Amino acid sequence: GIVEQCXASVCSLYQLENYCN
Amino acid sequence: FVNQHLXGSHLVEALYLVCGERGFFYTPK
To answer: Number of structural domains, chain B?
Structure first.
């Protein structure tokens, strides 16, 4: 999930946008 | 600001700025 991909590892715009509505 | 480690309030701030009027979901597994 988002914490593993963006906090525990470096985030990306592709991944952040997957959490936009 | 996106391409770094973002934790806690820093991560919800990035979601807020990127997602705009869409809004977002913050679902820490």
So the answer is: 1
